[PDB]
Design a binder for this molecule. Sequence first.
Ligand code: NAP
Ligand code: ZST
Length: 316
Amino acid sequence: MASRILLNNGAKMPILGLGTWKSPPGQVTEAVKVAIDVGYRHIDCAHVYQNENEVGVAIQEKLREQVVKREELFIVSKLWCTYHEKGLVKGACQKTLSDLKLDYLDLYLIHWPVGFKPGKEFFPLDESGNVVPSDTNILDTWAAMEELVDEGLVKAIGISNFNHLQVEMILNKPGLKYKPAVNQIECHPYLTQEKLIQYCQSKGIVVTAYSPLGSPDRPWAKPEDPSLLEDPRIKAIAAKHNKTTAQVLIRFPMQRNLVVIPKSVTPERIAENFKVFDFELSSQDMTTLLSYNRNWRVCALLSCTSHKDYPFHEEF
Ligand SMILES: NC(=O)c1ccc[n+]([C@@H]2O[C@H](COP(=O)([O-])OP(=O)(O)OC[C@H]3O[C@@H](n4cnc5c(N)ncnc54)[C@H](OP(=O)(O)O)[C@@H]3O)[C@@H](O)[C@H]2O)c1
Ligand SMILES: O=C(O)Cc1nn(Cc2nc3cc(C(F)(F)F)ccc3s2)c(=O)c2ccccc12
């Protein structure tokens, strides 16, 4: 298992990164410090996570301590939905860079294919609970992303939560300057994404799997919901390898030639989650895990389902 994958810009992206959604600012600095100490070189960030300053503190300290060099780190962030207007994109990227204390990102993603009304709120709702869209479109937002590459703010650009038709829209743009390098999508044994992965990989786009542990800390979880980490079938596969269920869930996407970004703020778990380069899932294991697909999505906000660019009405 090679630890990095080649992107379309010639850069290599570590296949294991640290997720930071729901990592509170009072804990995320320590999490990132520990992650860097134990070998993580990829950090997945976003403005909407409200913790980029604290991620930035940790990176800066480890650079200053001579633990890592900037060129060895792969820092990803994402353009939030309220900044899709062409005139807002650069400032959103620069705010992220300032918070992270960086002079470039390795990868910058369109976080979701939908634009929301610009303003202070991340989730502007009307009086009846519907998200308030903006009149922006995917291609104009992509053009603004391309400018960030041209100006040296970001080394690569990509997309997240795009369906295959939305990806195709960008690929087919007349006068396209940069192809998306990455599509970051939810992916785990209950949402295996076979068709979208096949699509993306056939078009030379690297897929990153988010919520690989099933995001048990997601704020809308219901007790009746399926739980990957507690699935006794996955426990049994883990036991056979003398690994944890999380380690199995992280290794699974790696063997599908995906990048994977498990989140933790717990130091023991951050270290555990990295110890996935010392075993292999068998062909039967892989087949069995894929068989658990239920098309069950843990990230898809009800209030957004009437947006014109809502991604999940399409089959894939
Ligand atoms: N692009 C997007 O739209 C998008 C959407 C969702 C997620 N993401 C990215 O993907 C990352 C990962 O997804 P996620 O945060 O939704 O969830 P996840 O990584 O599937 O699960 C994180 C949860 O699992 C727990 N956990 C971690 N390691 C564990 C272990 N070894 N044993 C038991 N429990 C463990 C964590 O607890 P503790 O932290 O308390 O240890 C946390 O509650 C995010 O943080 C974000 O960076 C991107
Ligand atoms: O965003 C993250 O990284 C994690 C994430 N996910 N979700 C669920 C979402 N579902 C969406 C669906 C659309 C849609 F495109 F479908 F309209 C657009 C935007 C969203 S946010 C959230 O509600 C959220 C809130 C704060 C911080 C991060 C998140």
